[PDB]
Design an enzyme around this catalytic site. Structure first.
Site, short mmCIF file in Angstrom:
data_model
loop_
_atom_site.label_atom_id
_atom_site.label_comp_id
_atom_site.label_asym_id
_atom_site.label_seq_id
_atom_site.Cartn_x
_atom_site.Cartn_y
_atom_site.Cartn_z
CD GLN A 120 -66.52 27.86 3.03
OE1 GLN A 120 -66.49 28.01 1.81
NE2 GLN A 120 -65.52 27.34 3.71
CG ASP A 130 -74.49 45.84 3.49
OD1 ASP A 130 -73.94 44.72 3.48
OD2 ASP A 130 -75.60 46.01 2.89
#
Length: 236
Positions: A16, A110
């Site tokens: 999730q 990132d």
């Protein structure tokens, strides 16, 4: 790019929105994320977009990378078996994906092991102060060169087999220390020429850091050009 909702079978939950492992057209294993860049960018070391369901509840479908993130991989049962040639070869694939991003004038922002995905036969693909260049964290100056900085950090993840960078330091202390010229020291058993490459990625002036084209070439050639006498040790 559009596919029908019934062509996708969601089989195992992976995270999730949500991430699943599933089937596409009862033939193809795929990864599935639940409720424009990936259509343009195409490269062997970038995770490939397969399909989209583009009306809420939306579905993005990509190639399935059987080993999950590189962070999970390095920290699992395989870590104890990886040696420098395996880690350098992975670093070289990532540089390769990043050389493409570079060439397309994109910025990742990132880059770090948790955002690399790993497949069979060690295929690795491109898919946070400790990983972020000073000028990006301080001034919002994100560029291909701040990615190069992160890539140097990722080199230390590879060479420690997944340890968090700057052991023992909290974020503020990392940022305070890095501003003063501190850099992580050579990881245990890691050759100095490889740590020197890290140090190149971590140069104060963003413009003095090497390109990913340079990093890729250097890492592909590592064992002939730089460490022709390399011998496997206990961990690297």
């Amino acid at each position: 790019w559009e596919i029908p909702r019934e062509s996708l079978r969601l089989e195992v939950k992976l995270g999730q929105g949500e991430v699943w492992m599933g089937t596409w057209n009862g033939t193809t294993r795929v990864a599935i994320k639940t409720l424009q860049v990936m259509k343009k960018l195409r490269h062997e070391k970038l995770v490939q977009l397969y399909a989209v369901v583009s009306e809420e509840p939306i579905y993005i479908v990509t190639e399935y990378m059987s080993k999950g993130s590189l962070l999970d991989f390095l920290k699992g049962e395989m870590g104890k078996y990886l040696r420098l040639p395996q880690l350098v070869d992975m670093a070289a694939q990532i540089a390769s994906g990043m050389a493409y991003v570079e060439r397309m004038n994109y910025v990742h922002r990132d880059l770090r092991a948790a955002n690399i995905l790993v497949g069979e036969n060690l295929v690795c693909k491109v898919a946070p102060i400790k990983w972020t260049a000073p000028e990006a964290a301080l001034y919002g100056r994100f560029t291909i060169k701040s990615d190069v900085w992160s890539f140097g950090i990722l080199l230390t993840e590879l060479t420690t087999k997944g340890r968090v960078p700057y052991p023992g330091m909290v974020n503020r202390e990392v940022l305070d220390q890095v501003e003063r010229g501190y850099r992580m020291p050579c990881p245990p058993e890691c050759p100095e020429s490889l740590h020197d490459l890290m140090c190149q990625c971590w140069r104060k002036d963003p413009e003095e850091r090497p390109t990913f084209e340079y990093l890729q070439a250097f890492l592909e050639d590592y064992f002939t050009s730089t460490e022709p006498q390399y011998q496997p040790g206990e961990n690297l």
